[PDB]
Amino acid sequence: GLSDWELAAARAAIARGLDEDLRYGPDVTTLATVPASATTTASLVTREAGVVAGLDVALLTLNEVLGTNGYRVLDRVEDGARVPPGEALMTLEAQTRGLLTAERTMLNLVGHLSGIATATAAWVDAVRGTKAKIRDTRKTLPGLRALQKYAVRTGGGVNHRLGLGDAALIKDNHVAAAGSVVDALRAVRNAAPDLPCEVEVDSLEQLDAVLPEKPELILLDNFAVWQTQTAVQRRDSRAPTVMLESSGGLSLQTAATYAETGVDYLAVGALTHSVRVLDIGLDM
Amino acid sequence: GLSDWELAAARAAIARGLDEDLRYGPDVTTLATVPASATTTASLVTREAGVVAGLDVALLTLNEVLGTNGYRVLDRVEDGARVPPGEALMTLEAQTRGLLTAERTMLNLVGHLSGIATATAAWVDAVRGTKAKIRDTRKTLPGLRALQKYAVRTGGGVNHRLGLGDAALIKDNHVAAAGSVVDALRAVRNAAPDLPCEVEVDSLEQLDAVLPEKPELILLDNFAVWQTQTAVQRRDSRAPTVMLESSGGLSLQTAATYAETGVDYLAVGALTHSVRVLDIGLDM
Numbered sequence: 429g430l431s432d433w434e435l436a437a438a439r440a441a442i443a444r445g446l447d448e449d450l451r452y453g454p455d456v457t458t459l460a461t462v463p464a465s466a467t468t469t470a471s472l473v474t475r476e477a478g479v480v481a482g483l484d485v486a487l488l489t490l491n492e493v494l495g496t497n498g499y500r501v502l503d504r505v506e507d508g509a510r511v512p513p514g515e516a517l518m519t520l521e522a523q524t525r526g527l528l529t530a531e532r533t534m535l536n537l538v539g540h541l542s543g544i545a546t547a548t549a550a551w552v553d554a555v556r557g558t559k560a561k562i563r564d565t566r567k568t569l570p571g572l573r574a575l576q577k578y579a580v581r582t583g584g585g586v587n588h589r590l591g592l593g594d595a596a597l598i599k600d601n602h603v604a605a606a607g608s609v610v611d612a613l614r615a616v617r618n619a620a621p622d623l624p625c626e627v628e629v630d631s632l633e634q635l636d637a638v639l640p641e642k643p644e645l646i647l648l649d650n651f652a653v654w655q656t657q658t659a660v661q662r663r664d665s666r667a668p669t670v671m672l673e674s675s676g677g678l679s680l681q682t683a684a685t686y687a688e689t690g691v692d693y694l695a696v697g698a699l700t701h702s703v704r705v706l707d708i709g710l711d712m
Numbered sequence: 713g714l715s716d717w718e719l720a721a722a723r724a725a726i727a728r729g730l731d732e733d734l735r736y737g738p739d740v741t742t743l744a745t746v747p748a749s750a751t752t753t754a755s756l757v758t759r760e761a762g763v764v765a766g767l768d769v770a771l772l773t774l775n776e777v778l779g780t781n782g783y784r785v786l787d788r789v790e791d792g793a794r795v796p797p798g799e800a801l802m803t804l805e806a807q808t809r810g811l812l813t814a815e816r817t818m819l820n821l822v823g824h825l826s827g828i829a830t831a832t833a834a835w836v837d838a839v840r841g842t843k844a845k846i847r848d849t850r851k852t853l854p855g856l857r858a859l860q861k862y863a864v865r866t867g868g869g870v871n872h873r874l875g876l877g878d879a880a881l882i883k884d885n886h887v888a889a890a891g892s893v894v895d896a897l898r899a900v901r902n903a904a905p906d907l908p909c910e911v912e913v914d915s916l917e918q919l920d921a922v923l924p925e926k927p928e929l930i931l932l933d934n935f936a937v938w939q940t941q942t943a944v945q946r947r948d949s950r951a952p953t954v955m956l957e958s959s960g961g962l963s964l965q966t967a968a969t970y971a972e973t974g975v976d977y978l979a980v981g982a983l984t985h986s987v988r989v990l991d992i993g994l995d996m
């Protein structure tokens with residue numbers, strides 16, 4: 429499921445999580461109430477409906493606390509599964525002390541990632557019957573980019589760039605510094621001709637100015653729906669190969685409206701910066 | 713503003729943030745569009761109203777990217793300031809290249825921490841005229857506990873425990889393993905007699921059972937307002953010294969209603985697990 433750098437990202441996050449929990453001493457309450465030889469069957473069950481993501485991270489949290497041979501998975505659901513309230517995402521058998529200590533860290537990761545995949549899916553359903561794909565941004569939390577990114581993919585969106593040197597994206601602050609969108613575009617092309625180039629426009633005027641330069645993608649920043657319609661109309665007639673991406677004034681209520689204008693992508697920051705946790709509990 | 717461990721935490725977070733942005737190559741678009749000698753005056757300004765928190769983290773991000781003597785702060789607001797849309801939280805003068813590279817990492821942190829402080833303050837205002845204090849939980853994001861915990865305090869909340877060995881808290885799964893709340897309570901009392909003890913009850917029945925044991929705090933889990941009122945009446949008559957904390961079915965709409973019952977605290981998970989970013993931009 430997770431790739432190598434995602435897996436490594438997950439391990440680093442679960443380690444930071446456990447360290448936050450354990451740095452003040454051991455789990456005194458678990459140690460005191462449950463014997464070392466105790467063993468139970470527990471299930472991660474959703475208190476609500478949504479799309480599940482990050483189940484492997486649950487397994488990595490246990491590997492860290494109990495060791496690979498410290499637990500047994502009697503059953504599990506697959507990442508990306510649409511799930512109702514009360515559904516058992518995974519049933520385990522493991523040393524009780526290990527589960528009570530690992531509980532919060534593992535639940536915190538799975539609820540966050542599931543919350544993103546559940547949101548992402550909402551957006552994906554909203555623009556169904558359209559050609560628009562939902563994309564994320566770099567408005568991710570430090571240390572969780574690979575995981576948050578993985579989660580939007582699980583819900584059906586498509587990742588944008590993972591970093592700064594990943595692809596070029598000429599922003600308002602660059603244009604300001606370069607003095608002109610076409611100047612900046614030209615500069616980026618000359619410096620990194622092999623790198624994907626996206627140019628951000630703030631108006632129909634700038635839009636007209638960059639279409640002839642034929643950048644890979646144009647990001648329509650904070651365009652009203654009527655302006656997005658015009659943009660697509662101009663792109664379609666003047667530079668059929670330029671992809672258009674809406675970003676800025678996007679809400680789930682307007683997603684379809686923008687998608688219907690014919691844009692190729694909707695870039696949603698909310699997907700990673702304003703996530704509502706999917707409520708999950710560990711039941712014994 | 714930030715303490716030593718919070719500072720070390722911020723530093724670790726900013727470093728993980730920058731590494732995510734730079735691991736694919738340098739900021740190609742900035743290097744190409746802005747000269748090394750470029751310098752600007754920039755401001756972090758809110759696109760929305762809210763409470764500000766995490767400004768020092770912005771500075772720490774610049775120290776890391778431009779070095780201490782790489783910039784100058786012409787003006788700044790204090791953490792915890794209630795702020796309107798379009799307010800300039802901090803005005804800097806710095807090398808342009810350094811700002812554009814630091815921008816996203818610093819913005820993502822300040823936005824996150826401010827979103828938390830903004831939400832916390834809404835809860836705090838909600839229970840105003842009551843004696844209840846708003847507290848957080850361990851439902852924090854991995855690697856960000858110290859910072860998230862710092863933010864609820866900036867918003868007016870009061871921190872709960874920071875980890876597992878920090879204070880004792882008997883939960884449902886412990887009760888399940890110990891076979892009883894009173895059993896579990898007795899066990900913890902024997903193991904860590906010097907440690908603060910909080911026990912979680914799911915019913916007025918368990919409440920009656922633990923009140924005589926006189927634990928430090930009792931967490932009323934998912935009680936209706938009427939049950940919360942009853943519990944306050946029983947506590948007041950049977951164990952005046954026992955503090956009560958509501959946690960579970962809390963919404964900002966009901967906050968005051970529960971606070972009015974006379975409980976000492978409201979423990980809010982949403983404060984740290986479902987945060988809506990405060991929208992902030994770097995304007996040059």
Ligand SMILES: O=P(O)(O)CP(=O)(O)O[C@H]1O[C@H](COP(=O)(O)O)[C@@H](O)[C@H]1O
Binds near residue numbers: 698
């Ligand atoms: O408002 P700006 O001057 O364009 C600065 P900003 O840091 O917002 O720039 C980015 O944010 C938007 C990302 O999706 P969302 O809006 O949902 O968060 C998009 O406008 C981006 O180029």
Ligand SMILES: O=P(O)(O)CP(=O)(O)O[C@H]1O[C@H](COP(=O)(O)O)[C@@H](O)[C@H]1O
Binds near residue numbers: 710884934982
């Ligand atoms: O539903 P449970 O069986 O009590 C498991 P859970 O992990 O929810 O247990 C904790 O969550 C609540 C925290 O505040 P919030 O609800 O806002 O997130 C509270 O019930 C806690 O003891």
Ligand SMILES: O=C(O)c1ccccc1C(=O)O
Binds near residue numbers: 564695
């Ligand atoms: O994070 C951003 O500012 C952003 C917002 C929208 C599209 C893409 C990006 C990006 O840089 O990849």
Ligand SMILES: O=C(O)c1ccccc1C(=O)O
Binds near residue numbers: 532850851872873959
């Ligand atoms: O994270 C939790 O389950 C939690 C929830 C509410 C209060 C306190 C805690 C805690 O363990 O400190």
Ligand SMILES: [Mn+2]
Binds near residue numbers: 649
């Ligand atoms: Mn933008």
Ligand SMILES: [Mn+2]
Binds near residue numbers: 759991993
């Ligand atoms: Mn914006």
Ligand SMILES: [Mn+2]
Binds near residue numbers: 933
């Ligand atoms: Mn609970």
Ligand SMILES: [Mn+2]
Binds near residue numbers: 475707709
């Ligand atoms: Mn719950």
